[PDB]
RNA sequence: AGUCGAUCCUAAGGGUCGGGGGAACCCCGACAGAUAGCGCGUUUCGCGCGUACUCCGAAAGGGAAUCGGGUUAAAAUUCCU
RNA sequence: GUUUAACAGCCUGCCCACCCUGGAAACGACUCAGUCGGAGGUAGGGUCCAGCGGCUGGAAGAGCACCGCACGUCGCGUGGUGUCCGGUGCGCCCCCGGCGGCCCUUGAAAAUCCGGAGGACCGAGUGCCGUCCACGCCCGGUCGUACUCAUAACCGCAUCAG
RNA sequence: UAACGUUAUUUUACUUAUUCCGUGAAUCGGAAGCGGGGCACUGCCCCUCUUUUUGGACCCAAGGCUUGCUUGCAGGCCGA
């Protein structure tokens, strides 16, 4: 008991060698990491034209969760389900004399088909991924949806859209019709999305983005402004 | 010719701290310097504590 | 994640040993340097005979690709005789010659008589 | 019609520096947290001669700030420094000959050597034997210090640039006459193939503008244009004046 | 020929990856970069270190180890003792 | 002509360097030259370092010289004696030691080897854990190796006074 | 010499393009705490990051709190 004692270490310039510390912010990262970080920095710094800036304002968290839990029950059949349905149809063709089957109600995907449905005015709701690369594929989609009076929303995750439609990624999704039991909630989500995106399209058309400097330069500017205000008062 | 398999240990070892590397006078000087410097460090720390107590 | 080193090191990733679907070569190659190919023929010059008589040593003409270990193994296989040491040289004509000294348990003269020189 | 010697210099391969026996570059420690904020102590272990360099160099051993090992450095020796001396490098280092300090901490009128041009470059100014820079004034508004260089020029550098207190050792070397060609041969043998030098008027026209003639003479003004192409730019280049003062 | 050399090391330098040029033959050469790997214990996996060439370049530089005596027409610090 | 190899042991201990006692002017010691000493001289006693130094084993059984017997065509046969004791040196070749002069010249790197600072970790009671100690056991690849190296063995058209 | 508009030359602001420098990319920016000073009274503002008689050494955490279960030992926070 009396043999135990403290051995404090005096850490400082010229003192005891410091212990292992977090050096993550000083790491010489690989080229890919460095470039992907600098790309984000440059996009933040440069001024974003309104057409691209409109993609920074995505659907709110609660609204997105509601929309996606709604979409999960309209997913397209997977490969196993398709094969099972096809084999059942083949088995029952002759025996059941080709019985009629109700038209399926599922989400639509694929930029070609979505654009065609929007142009034909069959689409009732459009969902656009915010991180499409190259973004020229969907930068005009909000304008087309506004012109066709089709409610559209911009959501986070082409990967999440692809997961909805059993794909790695999906540029956009579309709903053309909804079930009777879901019509009321679909109308609710539709009015929310229309008030969020479609009605603000005109005002967002003139709003530029970007122009955000680094934290250190922001602090310098704030210090200069504080000095100026203190001197002026 | 200094290889262990070729030369006896006593021929290549000196029985003292830093034996075979530092001379006896150098080792003595190092020991004295270490002891005196640690003593002066203790003296400085005690003097600083006493001054802090006084103020 | 906590990084204590400023330098970035490539992480270690699993590697797999080759498991080819087909063998590139259908079957293993033949053993070109067998004992018969190693031992061409004994030397029957005056110097070779003197070596046999005096130093209990046989003189052989050997494949240039053969080493001392292979020469010893080939001599053992061919004649069932131990070797104390094998010395080798390459003659100016380009062929390898080997002085193979048998152990005292074996008689070079008897071995030569059995071989047929 | 032939490439002149001055032109051939640039290709090198016989005009490259002779550096076989040199002891490595002489420079300050890499600027780090300890030197930026406090001070770091090292010990001078040896004073050595660097072939081809008039000024002696000093080997200094430091304790690594954050590793268990010795940090070895080679500084341009300042006059008065000796083996076993303690050297202090940092912003808070005392103003003593041999210490390396940021120019912001060096009062006006101070004599320094091996002055940095860019913060952290480890010293580029006033490194030759007997040479030094003088601190003239400070400007806190833009954080810049003014210095007088050995040539007499006044230069403005960031106040964070470091400099060693004192003048470079080995001064007065050039006072001694050499008296013979052998001394110059030995001097330049460890520097580069730049000696002896053949006068242009002693050559034929093919290899020098000054060559030729039945008498030895230039035949045209030895002052040449600043924009004269290589091979033609010989003599007194862009001279604003000539002759005695 | 384990003992004499090459072989090993590196010198001036040479040849290169990546990168940068170049119509291209090629040019610069570790300089635009996720290095080779190295130690400890092991359910062969874990832990800890890891500054972009572990390449060529000396039968006079550096460097593991042999001595007498004898022997052939011609070999020996290599053959015999 | 009257010889003694590598290697192993013991002894010795150049010129230096180092250690203990002690405390010096009337200064002393000292080299061819210098130089050294209260930061400890002279003096007394020791330690270490080199050796291509000494003795022993190797090793006299070998080599050499001399004197005999024998086959006398082919015994590479057979036997004895000696190989000892001193001197000398601005001598000659090589190696080493220690000083001094010279430089605005300061006169390579790496492989490799040795030593040291630290002590995480580690063992038992008639056996355990370690052990750079002594002895014993096994193995050691590939290529070059003849000869000339020159008034004829290389180059100069040659067996060329270069 | 200004309301409108054209033209030319200078001064100056930003940093992400671009250029340059240093490093084995090892404490960069802001704030807050531990200590030291004054004020008058409980708050303010002003400063520091621990090392300067010596040719020494310095790494791989002691200690405290807290969990698995009662520790072969192992997992977290402070120390930092
Ligand atoms: K030319
Ligand atoms: K020259
Ligand atoms: K001249
Ligand atoms: K002329
Ligand atoms: K003239
Ligand atoms: K290229
Ligand atoms: K390269
Ligand atoms: K060699
Ligand atoms: K022998
Ligand atoms: K030997
Ligand atoms: K040890
Ligand atoms: K030979
Ligand atoms: K030769
Ligand atoms: Mg790397
Ligand atoms: Mg003249
Ligand atoms: Mg390439
Ligand atoms: Mg190698
Ligand atoms: Mg005899
Ligand atoms: Mg120890
Ligand atoms: Mg010819």
From Swiss-Prot, chain B:
<comment type="similarity">
    <text>Belongs to the eukaryotic ribosomal protein eL34 family.</text>
</comment>
<protein>
    <recommendedName>
        <fullName>Large ribosomal subunit protein eL34</fullName>
    </recommendedName>
</protein>
Curated annotation (Swiss-Prot), chain C:
<keyword id="KW-0689">Ribosomal protein</keyword>
<keyword id="KW-0694">RNA-binding</keyword>
<comment type="similarity">
    <text>Belongs to the universal ribosomal protein uL23 family.</text>
</comment>
<protein>
    <recommendedName>
        <fullName>Large ribosomal subunit protein uL23</fullName>
    </recommendedName>
</protein>
<dbReference type="GO" id="GO:0019843">
    <property type="term" value="F:rRNA binding"/>
</dbReference>
<dbReference type="GO" id="GO:0006412">
    <property type="term" value="P:translation"/>
</dbReference>
<comment type="function">
    <text>This protein binds to a specific region on the 26S rRNA.</text>
</comment>
<dbReference type="GO" id="GO:0003735">
    <property type="term" value="F:structural constituent of ribosome"/>
</dbReference>
<dbReference type="GO" id="GO:0022625">
    <property type="term" value="C:cytosolic large ribosomal subunit"/>
</dbReference>
<dbReference type="GO" id="GO:0003729">
    <property type="term" value="F:mRNA binding"/>
</dbReference>
<keyword id="KW-0687">Ribonucleoprotein</keyword>
<keyword id="KW-0699">rRNA-binding</keyword>
